[PDB]
mmCIF file of C-alpha atoms in Angstrom:
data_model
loop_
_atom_site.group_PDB
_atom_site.id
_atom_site.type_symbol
_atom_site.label_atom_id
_atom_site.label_comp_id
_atom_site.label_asym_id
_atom_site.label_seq_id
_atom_site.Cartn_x
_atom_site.Cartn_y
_atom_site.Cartn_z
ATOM 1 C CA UNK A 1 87.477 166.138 -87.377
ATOM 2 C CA UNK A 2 84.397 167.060 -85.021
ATOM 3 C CA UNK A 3 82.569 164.203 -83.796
ATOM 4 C CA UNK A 4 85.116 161.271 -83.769
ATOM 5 C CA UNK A 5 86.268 162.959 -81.012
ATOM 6 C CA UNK A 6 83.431 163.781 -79.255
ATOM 7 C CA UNK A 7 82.542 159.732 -80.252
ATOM 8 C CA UNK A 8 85.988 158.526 -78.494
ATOM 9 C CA UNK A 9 87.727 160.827 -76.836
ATOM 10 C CA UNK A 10 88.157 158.884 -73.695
ATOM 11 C CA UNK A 11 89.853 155.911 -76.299
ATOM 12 C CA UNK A 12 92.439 158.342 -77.925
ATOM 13 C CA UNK A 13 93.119 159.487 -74.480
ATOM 14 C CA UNK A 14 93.493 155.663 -73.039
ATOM 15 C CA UNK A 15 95.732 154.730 -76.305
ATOM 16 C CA UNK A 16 97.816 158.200 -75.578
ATOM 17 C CA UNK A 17 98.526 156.719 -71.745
ATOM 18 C CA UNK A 18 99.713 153.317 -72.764
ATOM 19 C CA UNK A 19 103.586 152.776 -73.339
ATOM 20 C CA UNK A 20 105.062 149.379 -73.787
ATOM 21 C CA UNK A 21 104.912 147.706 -77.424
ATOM 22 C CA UNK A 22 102.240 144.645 -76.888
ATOM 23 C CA UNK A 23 100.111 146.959 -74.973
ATOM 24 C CA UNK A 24 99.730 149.886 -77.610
ATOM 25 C CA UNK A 25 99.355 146.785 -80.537
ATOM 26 C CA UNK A 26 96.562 144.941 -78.462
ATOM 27 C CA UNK A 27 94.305 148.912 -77.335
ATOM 28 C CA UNK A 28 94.865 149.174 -81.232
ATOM 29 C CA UNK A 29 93.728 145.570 -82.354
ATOM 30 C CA UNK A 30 90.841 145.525 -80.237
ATOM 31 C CA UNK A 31 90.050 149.547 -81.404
ATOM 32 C CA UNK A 32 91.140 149.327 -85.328
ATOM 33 C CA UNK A 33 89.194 152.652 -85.752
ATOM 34 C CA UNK A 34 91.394 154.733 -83.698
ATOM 35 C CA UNK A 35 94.611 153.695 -86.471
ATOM 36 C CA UNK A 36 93.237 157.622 -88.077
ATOM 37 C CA UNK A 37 94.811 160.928 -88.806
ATOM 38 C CA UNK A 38 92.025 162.253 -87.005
ATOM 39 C CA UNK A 39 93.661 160.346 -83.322
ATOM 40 C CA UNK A 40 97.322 161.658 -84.227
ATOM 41 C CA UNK A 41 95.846 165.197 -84.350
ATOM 42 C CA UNK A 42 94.004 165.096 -81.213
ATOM 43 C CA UNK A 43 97.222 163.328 -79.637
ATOM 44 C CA UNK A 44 99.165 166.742 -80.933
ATOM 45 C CA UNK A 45 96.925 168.825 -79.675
ATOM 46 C CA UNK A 46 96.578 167.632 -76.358
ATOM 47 C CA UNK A 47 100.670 167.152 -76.053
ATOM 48 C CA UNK A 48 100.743 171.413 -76.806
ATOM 49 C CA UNK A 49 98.138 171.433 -74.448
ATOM 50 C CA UNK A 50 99.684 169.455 -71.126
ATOM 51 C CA UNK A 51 102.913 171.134 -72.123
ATOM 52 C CA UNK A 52 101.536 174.585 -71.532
ATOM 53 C CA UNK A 53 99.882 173.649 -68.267
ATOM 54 C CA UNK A 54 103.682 172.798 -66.939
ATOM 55 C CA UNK A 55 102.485 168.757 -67.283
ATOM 56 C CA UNK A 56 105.869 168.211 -68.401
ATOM 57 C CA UNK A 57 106.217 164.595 -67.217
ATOM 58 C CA UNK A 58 102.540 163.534 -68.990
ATOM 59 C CA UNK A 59 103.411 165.102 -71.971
ATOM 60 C CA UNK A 60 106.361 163.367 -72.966
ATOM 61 C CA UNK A 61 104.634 159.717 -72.418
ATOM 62 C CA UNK A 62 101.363 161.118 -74.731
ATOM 63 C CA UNK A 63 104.483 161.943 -76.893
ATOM 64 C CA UNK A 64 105.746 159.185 -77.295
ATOM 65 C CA UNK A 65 101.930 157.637 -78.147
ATOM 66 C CA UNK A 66 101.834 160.452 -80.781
ATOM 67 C CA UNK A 67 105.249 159.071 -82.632
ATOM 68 C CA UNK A 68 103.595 155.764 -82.711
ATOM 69 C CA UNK A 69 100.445 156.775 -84.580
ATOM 70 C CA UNK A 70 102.525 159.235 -86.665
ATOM 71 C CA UNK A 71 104.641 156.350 -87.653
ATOM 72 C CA UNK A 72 101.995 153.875 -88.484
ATOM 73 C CA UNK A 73 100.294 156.029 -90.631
ATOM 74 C CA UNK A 74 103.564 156.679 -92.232
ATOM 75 C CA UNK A 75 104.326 153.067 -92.623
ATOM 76 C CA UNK A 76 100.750 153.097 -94.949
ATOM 77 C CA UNK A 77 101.285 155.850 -97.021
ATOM 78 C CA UNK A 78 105.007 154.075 -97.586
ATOM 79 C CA UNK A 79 103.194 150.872 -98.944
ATOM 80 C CA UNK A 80 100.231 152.407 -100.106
ATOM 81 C CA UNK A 81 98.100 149.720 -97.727
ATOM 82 C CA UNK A 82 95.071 151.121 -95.346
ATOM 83 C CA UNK A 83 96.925 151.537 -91.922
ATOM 84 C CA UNK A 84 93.893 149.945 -90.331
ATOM 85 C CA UNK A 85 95.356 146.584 -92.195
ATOM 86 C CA UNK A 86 98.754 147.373 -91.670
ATOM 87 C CA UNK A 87 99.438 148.878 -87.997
ATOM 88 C CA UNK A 88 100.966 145.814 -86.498
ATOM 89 C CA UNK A 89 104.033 145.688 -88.510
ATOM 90 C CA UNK A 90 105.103 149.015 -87.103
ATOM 91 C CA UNK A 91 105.693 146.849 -83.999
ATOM 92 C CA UNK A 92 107.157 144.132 -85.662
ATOM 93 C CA UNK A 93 109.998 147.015 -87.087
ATOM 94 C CA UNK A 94 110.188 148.705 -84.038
ATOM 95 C CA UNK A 95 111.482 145.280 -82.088
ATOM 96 C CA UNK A 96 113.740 144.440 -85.341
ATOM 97 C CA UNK A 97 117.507 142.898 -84.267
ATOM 98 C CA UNK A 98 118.914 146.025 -86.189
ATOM 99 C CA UNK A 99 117.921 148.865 -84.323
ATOM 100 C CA UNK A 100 117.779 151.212 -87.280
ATOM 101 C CA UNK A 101 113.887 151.826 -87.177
ATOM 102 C CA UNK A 102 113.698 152.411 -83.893
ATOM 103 C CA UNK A 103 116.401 154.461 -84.072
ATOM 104 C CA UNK A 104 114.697 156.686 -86.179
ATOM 105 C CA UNK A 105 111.213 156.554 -83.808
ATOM 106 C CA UNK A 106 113.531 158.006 -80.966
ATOM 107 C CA UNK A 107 115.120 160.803 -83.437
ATOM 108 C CA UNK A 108 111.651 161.779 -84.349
ATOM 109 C CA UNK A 109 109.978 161.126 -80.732
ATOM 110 C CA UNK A 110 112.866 163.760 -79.193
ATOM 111 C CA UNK A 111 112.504 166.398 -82.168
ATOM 112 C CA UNK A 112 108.818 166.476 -81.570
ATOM 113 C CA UNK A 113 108.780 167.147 -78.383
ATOM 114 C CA UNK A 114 111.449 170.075 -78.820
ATOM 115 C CA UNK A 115 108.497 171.562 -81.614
ATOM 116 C CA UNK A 116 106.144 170.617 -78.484
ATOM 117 C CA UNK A 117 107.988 172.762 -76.130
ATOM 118 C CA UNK A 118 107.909 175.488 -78.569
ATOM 119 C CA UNK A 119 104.312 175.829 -79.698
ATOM 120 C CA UNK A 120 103.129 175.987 -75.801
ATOM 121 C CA UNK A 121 105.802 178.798 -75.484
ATOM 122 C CA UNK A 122 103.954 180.390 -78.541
ATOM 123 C CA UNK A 123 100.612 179.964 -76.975
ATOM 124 C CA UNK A 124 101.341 182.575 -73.776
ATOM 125 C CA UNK A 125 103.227 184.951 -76.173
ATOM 126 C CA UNK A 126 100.324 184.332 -78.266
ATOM 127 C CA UNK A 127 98.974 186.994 -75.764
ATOM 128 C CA UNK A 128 101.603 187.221 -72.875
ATOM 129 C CA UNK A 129 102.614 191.045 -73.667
#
């Protein structure tokens, strides 16, 4: 929750603006602390929130950041490890010859940004009339 946030904020954001594979597994690697529930919920938050402001484009690539934390953490609760110990084989998966996993990352990447694209839409009926 409240202040591992306001502790790194700027680091969620930075990890939310990366994209290719060895880039996201390095941020993480070098800032272990961030591989938390508490980054995939400000990653949520802040996709609802671009979304609403008509930031479209940026959304979609924080998006796809989200998945990837979503996914790791996943991946833990699957083998009951810490995903602080554990994060890196998400990328190993992702890249596997069989593209079944990542399959699955881009079924889940494109239905989260449809519930994305919703809850903004909520959020100006939330008091539009």
């Amino acid at each position: 929750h409240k202040t591992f946030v306001e502790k790194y904020e700027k680091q969620i954001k930075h990890f939310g603006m990366l994209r290719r594979w060895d880039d996201s597994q390095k941020y993480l690697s070098d800032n272990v602390h961030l591989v938390c529930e508490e980054t995939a919920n400000y990653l949520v938050i802040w996709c609802i929130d671009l979304e609403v402001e008509e930031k479209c484009a940026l959304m979609e690539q924080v998006a796809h950041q989200t998945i990837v934390m979503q996914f790791i953490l996943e991946l833990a609760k699957s083998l009951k490890v810490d995903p602080r110990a554990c994060f890196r084989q998400f990328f190993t998966k992702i890249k596997t010859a069989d593209r079944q996993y990542m399959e699955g990352f881009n079924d889940e990447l494109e239905a989260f940004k449809e519930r994305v694209r919703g809850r903004a839409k909520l959020r100006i009926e939330k008091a539009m009339k």
